[PDB]
Amino acid sequence: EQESVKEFLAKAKEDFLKKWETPSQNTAQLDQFDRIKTLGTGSFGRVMLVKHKESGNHYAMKILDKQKVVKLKQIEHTLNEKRILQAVNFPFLVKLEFSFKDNSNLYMVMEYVAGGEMFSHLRRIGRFSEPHARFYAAQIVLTFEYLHSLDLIYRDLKPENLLIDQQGYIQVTDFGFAKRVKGRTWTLCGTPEYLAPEIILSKGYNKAVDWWALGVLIYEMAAGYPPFFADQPIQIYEKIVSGKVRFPSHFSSDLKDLLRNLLQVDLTKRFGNLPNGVNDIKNHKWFATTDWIAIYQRKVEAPFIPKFKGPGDTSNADDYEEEEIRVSINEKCGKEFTEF
């Protein structure tokens, strides 16, 4: 019975691996697209909603300036993003439709999800009911079990990176810091409020930090605010290490117990790491109502169904200065991204 899931990952790891050892590469070109708007603009990031020319399909094209990625020492990570991204496949994993590059940029043509960054919707609602926090949570539990099975580590779990597709389910994005390792790593990456203590103290860490961020995420969904916060990141890091949590009057004694384990400084006791595995999470009382297979198939009534105004410029979001994307007449950083 549970051999289904035991026999599922196998099939998926084989599927994953084959793609990870023989990456897909340069599978479309800029000109085969028409830029529609700029959905964001980062220090090196950038997401320009586009429409595929030959088919009228819309994609969220992510554009990374080559020279910046390097300056920010994000080469390995940027390559980690593409490589892991073209191999994985999961219901809650935004699909990278196309990839390619030119003289000045690297392009990752992501699937466009017209639902709504869970952030805005969360800050708008204030906080999600436990039942609802559970709904999204569950999907994360599963998506990690998928990722982790492939020796993958997300490292950037937070509402922001969670999109709510039209059916009301989640699609994870932003794999900038995802990496495939079996030992333990050391880079300092993630978002202040979601960093496990072993990252802050830079001890060296594993997939355990992902189960920590879940706690933080679950807590921030149910509370309405992160379990650890302040003005400057230096402080955040402090509140975290001291490791003392306080729950809201309205938290079920069941949420707190679960959260008391996810947000656990002690690696030998925290859920997700221990021998029994993801079942100390999956089998917790707070997840009693949850039917794990119901969700994978997505046969569950979503709590919130975004009023999406169809494909493209539905409505709202926010406007940025439509910066042109230039392609130098010279190739920039050839050897570096050769495998991109």
């Binding site: 220090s43 932003d174 810091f177 990456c189 605010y225 302040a230 990141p233």
Partner: peptide, 20 residues
């Protein structure tokens, strides 16, 4: 109230990953 203190702060908008 913890909620207001949160709201009063500046880390209530879209947060940026660290890696400068």
């Amino acid at each position: 109230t913890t909620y207001a203190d949160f709201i009063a702060s500046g880390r209530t908008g879209r947060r940026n990953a660290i890696h400068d």
